[PDB]
Amino acid sequence: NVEEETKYIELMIVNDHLMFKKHRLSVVHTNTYAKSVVNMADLIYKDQLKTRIVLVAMETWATDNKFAISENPLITLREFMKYRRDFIKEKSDAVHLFSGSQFESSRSGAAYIGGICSLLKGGGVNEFGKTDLMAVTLAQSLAHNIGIISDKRKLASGECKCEDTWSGCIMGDTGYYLPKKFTQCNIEEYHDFLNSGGGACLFNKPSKLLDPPECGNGFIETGEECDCGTPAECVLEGAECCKKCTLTQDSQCSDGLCCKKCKFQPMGTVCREAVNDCDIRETCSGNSSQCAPNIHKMDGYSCDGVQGICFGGRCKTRDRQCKYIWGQKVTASDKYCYEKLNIEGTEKGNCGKDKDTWIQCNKRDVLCGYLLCTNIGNIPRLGELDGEITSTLVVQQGRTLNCSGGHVKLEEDVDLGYVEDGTPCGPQMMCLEHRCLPVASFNFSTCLSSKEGTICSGNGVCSNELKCVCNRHWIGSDCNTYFPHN
Amino acid sequence: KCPAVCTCTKDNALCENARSIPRTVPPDVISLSFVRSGFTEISEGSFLFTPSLQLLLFTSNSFDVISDDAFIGLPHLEYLFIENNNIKSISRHTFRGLKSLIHLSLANNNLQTLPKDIFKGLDSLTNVDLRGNSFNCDCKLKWLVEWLGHTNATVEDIYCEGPPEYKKRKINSLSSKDFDCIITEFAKSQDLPYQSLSIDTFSYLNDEYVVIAQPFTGKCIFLEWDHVEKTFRNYDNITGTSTVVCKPIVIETQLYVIVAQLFGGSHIYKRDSFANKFIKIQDIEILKIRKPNDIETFKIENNWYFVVADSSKAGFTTIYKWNGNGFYSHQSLHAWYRDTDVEYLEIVRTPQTLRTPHLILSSSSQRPVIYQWNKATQLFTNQTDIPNMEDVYAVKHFSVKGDVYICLTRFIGDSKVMKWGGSSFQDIQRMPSRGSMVFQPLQINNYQYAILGSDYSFTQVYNWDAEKAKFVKFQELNVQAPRSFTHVSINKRNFLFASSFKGNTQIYKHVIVDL
Numbered sequence A: 001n002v003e004e005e006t007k008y009i010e011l012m013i014v015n016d017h018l019m020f021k022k023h024r025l026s027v028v029h030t031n032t033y034a035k036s037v038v039n040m041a042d043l044i045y046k047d048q049l050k051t052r053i054v055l056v057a058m059e060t061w062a063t064d065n066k067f068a069i070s071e072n073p074l075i076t077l078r079e080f081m082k083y084r085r086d087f088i089k090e091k092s093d094a095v096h097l098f099s100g101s102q103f104e105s106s107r108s109g110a111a112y113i114g115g116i117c118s119l120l121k122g123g124g125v126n127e128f129g130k131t132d133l134m135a136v137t138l139a140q141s142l143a144h145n146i147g148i149i150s151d152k153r154k155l156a157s158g159e160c161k162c163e164d165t166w167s168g169c170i171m172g173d174t175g176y177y178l179p180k181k182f183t184q185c186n187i188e189e190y191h192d193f194l195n196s197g198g199g200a201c202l203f204n205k206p207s208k209l210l211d212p213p214e215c216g217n218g219f220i221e222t223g224e225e226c227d228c229g230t231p232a233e234c235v236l237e238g239a240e241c242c243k244k245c246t247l248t249q250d251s252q253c254s255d256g257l258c259c260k261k262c263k264f265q266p267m268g269t270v271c272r273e274a275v276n277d278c279d280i281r282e283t284c285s286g287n288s289s290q291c292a293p294n295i296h297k298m299d300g301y302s303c304d305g306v307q308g309i310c311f312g313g314r315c316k317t318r319d320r321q322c323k324y325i326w327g328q329k330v331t332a333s334d335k336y337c338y339e340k341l342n343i344e345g346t347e348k349g350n351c352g353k354d355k356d357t358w359i360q361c362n363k364r365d366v367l368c369g370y371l372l373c374t375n376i377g378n379i380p381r382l383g384e385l386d387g388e389i390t391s392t393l394v395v396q397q398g399r400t401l402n403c404s405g406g407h408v409k410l411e412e413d414v415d416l417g418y419v420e421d422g423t424p425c426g427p428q429m430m431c432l433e434h435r436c437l438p439v440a441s442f443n444f445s446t447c448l449s450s451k452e453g454t455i456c457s458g459n460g461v462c463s464n465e466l467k468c469v470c471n472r473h474w475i476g477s478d479c480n481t482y483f484p485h486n
Numbered sequence B: 001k002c003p004a005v006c007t008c009t010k011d012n013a014l015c016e017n018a019r020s021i022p023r024t025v026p027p028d029v030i031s032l033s034f035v036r037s038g039f040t041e042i043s044e045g046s047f048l049f050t051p052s053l054q055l056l057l058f059t060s061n062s063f064d065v066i067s068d069d070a071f072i073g074l075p076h077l078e079y080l081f082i083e084n085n086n087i088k089s090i091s092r093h094t095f096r097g098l099k100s101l102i103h104l105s106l107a108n109n110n111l112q113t114l115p116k117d118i119f120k121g122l123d124s125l126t127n128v129d130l131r132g133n134s135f136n137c138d139c140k141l142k143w144l145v146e147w148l149g150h151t152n153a154t155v156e157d158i159y160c161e162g163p164p165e166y167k168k169r170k171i172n173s174l175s176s177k178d179f180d181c182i183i184t185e186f187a188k189s190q191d192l193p194y195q196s197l198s199i200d201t202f203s204y205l206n207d208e209y210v211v212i213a214q215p216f217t218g219k220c221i222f223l224e225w226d227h228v229e230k231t232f233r234n235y236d237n238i239t240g241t242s243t244v245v246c247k248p249i250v251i252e253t254q255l256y257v258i259v260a261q262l263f264g265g266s267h268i269y270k271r272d273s274f275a276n277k278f279i280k281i282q283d284i285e286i287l288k289i290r291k292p293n294d295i296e297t298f299k300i301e302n303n304w305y306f307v308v309a310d311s312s313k314a315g316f317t318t319i320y321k322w323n324g325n326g327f328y329s330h331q332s333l334h335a336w337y338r339d340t341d342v343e344y345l346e347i348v349r350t351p352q353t354l355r356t357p358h359l360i361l362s363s364s365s366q367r368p369v370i371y372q373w374n375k376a377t378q379l380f381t382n383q384t385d386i387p388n389m390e391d392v393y394a395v396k397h398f399s400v401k402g403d404v405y406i407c408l409t410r411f412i413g414d415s416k417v418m419k420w421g422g423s424s425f426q427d428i429q430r431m432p433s434r435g436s437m438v439f440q441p442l443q444i445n446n447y448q449y450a451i452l453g454s455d456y457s458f459t460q461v462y463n464w465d466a467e468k469a470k471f472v473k474f475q476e477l478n479v480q481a482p483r484s485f486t487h488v489s490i491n492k493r494n495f496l497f498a499s500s501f502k503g504n505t506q507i508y509k510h511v512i513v514d515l
């Protein structure tokens, strides 16, 4: 399925000026050192997470810092993401900063939760340390990008504990004896993120690594033809068709989802099923051993039966936000909870706070306001609970409803517990900044269409790459040309 | 009445090829000779039944050993002649019990050595012949020269057969210095099957016990002295999980043990004396201390403190004062750093002539820092770091005369000893070492040693040379992966405890070696 496949994180690393000074002002020293850190983090991910960390690119600042590195990891993370947005042109799944300085916090790095594949979000910042230590810091930063957030709820309950207490676990705090391992709860969090539609960019295998080709690493570099993984592993798949990184007599391929053994899979065979209704199935090209790069529906397609909208391949609803913050057993409150409590302008619901006062929502915006779930805990899975839990009770005509919420802080700015931007407040309407807006207010990009009032001329689906995926018998970039192949 | 093997004169008797020493020898025979005898040894009291002999002769015999007190029961013997025999061993007390012995000859037996005090206790002796033997001159014979000097008896000159340097030299002419034979050493005594992170000692009710932290079982192990066979045995345990450091503290005949764990740990225990079991007293705040690498005990100005180094970025190294009902937080240190080790030392800081309490703690990927306590603020200030030093794990200190030195352990590269100058530590000695997790100074009977542990290599034990003012290579211990070394003193007995992370713990005796 999606979680049985090998996932590949394309990674860029930026070394700041102090990291350059730690190394004696040697570019080769800095770059090879960071290659060592990435190598160890790759050894961590390779087994437990069935995921590989590949370094596509690196740059080091020899002269000075492009922006001032901050002792607060979150501030440095934010400005670093500004840098990579306005400056770095290189294609990567994640861009991480290696800082020679030291953060004034317990966290040795900061990374956005579920950030991968995102231009603004994907990335992290990591303070200087020992190779083995900084490999752990990078491992937990890329874990935060990858969707593994410690269950603050199962931890406080004692549900998720580290099987080995001697070193604890990666998602456990740094100490002299470096954590080598992820909890089973972490792996479950990662599987749940992949099945949720996140991480579509992790499914493509790189070709040219930053280091000269070596036959037998499992990657096809320049000058090779086929590669299986290892001599012992090769026997499982690819040992038949692959000899000394050169194809045998009959093979089109060595290893892959589209390679049956030595031969290609016919065009139109499905290597990957869609994980949700935001996802587009992928078919084997028959020109390639790899499953075609993972793509999903473009942002703005409706999911969950006009209960939510797709962003980055993941469905945004208020119920999934309630389950995200408070755990799976929690469900979102009835719409009447919003339609009543939010217009009051109290701590039990509101549009937000201005000076030490709650704003009462307008009747139009009432679904964009304070997030209300049904039976709530006091310990959110992520972030910091600020204050107490809100519970009111509203009667409708014989049905007594419980409206509960809480203020969960991640960034001093970003606050969970208010309806996430992009959640539908109604037909063709989404929430932005606690207000209910029509779709055109998001200015969505569109694919090609040859027909008035249709997407992909009505014959196809708009992907997140802004290319039309045609239905059967339809061809062309707009899918307007009918070309049956039988 | 004459024994069958022997043929007897009127006053004398002669025994040839006798298979045993006859007990039936008739009285008024004052002389007995054994020649080419069958028996291969002379046991104790063999002659008890023949008290009347004034003379005894042994010639042309092969003897495994002549036992202690073989001649006991011969008060009247003036003359004892052992000559031209093969004798493998001669006991120190063999001649004990003859006061009346006048002439004694060991001559021509080709004896390689003699035991000390073999001539002790014979007053009457006017003559000894040691000639005709091949003597290897060594410690064993070191006494002989001294005896030759102070003896009343007449002894003709005898010569060393060996060693090659001293061969054909008069034993009387020799001086003690030429006998060499000086050593000191550590020898393995006990082997503990359990692997141990750290070891410590304490004195409770004038009894010195030993605490050993075994990480992988989580149990804090206690060893007490047993006189029955071996001085070290395990009386008691404290149960825990992922125990790292176990530090006993005795305050006014009340035992307190601070034990740090990597799981839900950092608990303070006290010994309830009536039940003589340990009871949990306090729990260190889990937010302040998270992954302690270390615990350090010190007492300043009639106050007790202990400080815990936190190698987590999250935890802060914290010092806990004793209010007398227990321990409570005093000062957090080195916030946001990973602290491998904390070390307390009292060092003279110029201009001050008095010694002042100082802390030294070692942060990973960082220079060690020194902290000077200020009495007015009751706290350390003016943070200063050891200059030109990279990547240390621990710092330990020792004093020779008035000056103080520190042993800086660097897991990679050179580990080195520095001397404290007026304002600063100056480089003294640099020893590179491979995977060294400990550098331990020790002082045993005014003997300063420095043990440098190694995982991949041998553990190198060094001795302090007063003339050279540096450590000198001394001995090499084999211990699998030592994290620690600890000096234990029983009464008049000294032991060395070597913990092993990947292997069994080692217990060595402290041995002084002479003759």
Ligand SMILES: *[C@@H]1O[C@H](CO)[C@@H](O)[C@H](O)[C@H]1NC(C)=O
Pocket (backbone or CB within 6 Å): A285, A287
């Ligand atoms: C076939 O593979 C080549 C690369 O060998 C690629 O350039 C081309 O686009 C592929 N065609 C199809 C239809 O996948």
Ligand SMILES: *[C@@H]1O[C@H](CO)[C@@H](O)[C@H](O)[C@H]1NC(C)=O
Pocket (backbone or CB within 6 Å): A375, A376, A389, A390, A391, A393, A400, A402, A403, A404
């Ligand atoms: C609603 O939940 C709150 C706790 O969030 C609780 O105090 C209250 O009793 C609940 N009411 C009902 C009717 O379940």
Ligand SMILES: *[C@@H]1O[C@H](CO)[C@@H](O)[C@H](O)[C@H]1NC(C)=O
Pocket (backbone or CB within 6 Å): A440, A441, A443
């Ligand atoms: C959206 O952007 C397009 C061009 O990018 C522009 O023509 C249009 O006016 C924009 N609409 C809004 C509402 O900003």
Ligand SMILES: *[C@@H]1O[C@H](CO)[C@@H](O)[C@H](O)[C@H]1NC(C)=O
Pocket (backbone or CB within 6 Å): B150, B151, B152
């Ligand atoms: C050796 O003889 C001297 C006198 O010459 C005497 O003073 C001394 O006590 C004697 N020593 C022994 C052990 O008999």
Ligand SMILES: *[C@@H]1O[C@H](CO)[C@@H](O)[C@H](O)[C@H]1NC(C)=O
Pocket (backbone or CB within 6 Å): B217, B219, B234, B235, B236, B237
């Ligand atoms: C100490 O602990 C070990 C194992 O943890 C146990 O076998 C031993 O009997 C204990 N000894 C005492 C004296 O408690």
Ligand SMILES: *[C@@H]1O[C@H](CO)[C@@H](O)[C@H](O)[C@H]1NC(C)=O
Pocket (backbone or CB within 6 Å): B382, B384
């Ligand atoms: C410590 O500060 C005091 C003044 O507060 C000063 O006298 C002393 O020289 C300082 N020590 C060092 C090592 O700078």
Ligand SMILES: [Ca+2]
Pocket (backbone or CB within 6 Å): A008, A009, A010, A092, A093, A201, A202, A203, A204
């Ligand atoms: Ca990618």
Ligand SMILES: [Ca+2]
Pocket (backbone or CB within 6 Å): A213, A214, A215, A216, A217, A218, A219, A220, A221, A224, A227
């Ligand atoms: Ca290759």
Ligand SMILES: [Ca+2]
Pocket (backbone or CB within 6 Å): A272, A273, A274, A275, A279, A280, A281, A282, A294, A295, A296
């Ligand atoms: Ca897909």
Ligand SMILES: [Ca+2]
Pocket (backbone or CB within 6 Å): B294, B295, B296, B341, B342, B343
């Ligand atoms: Ca210490």
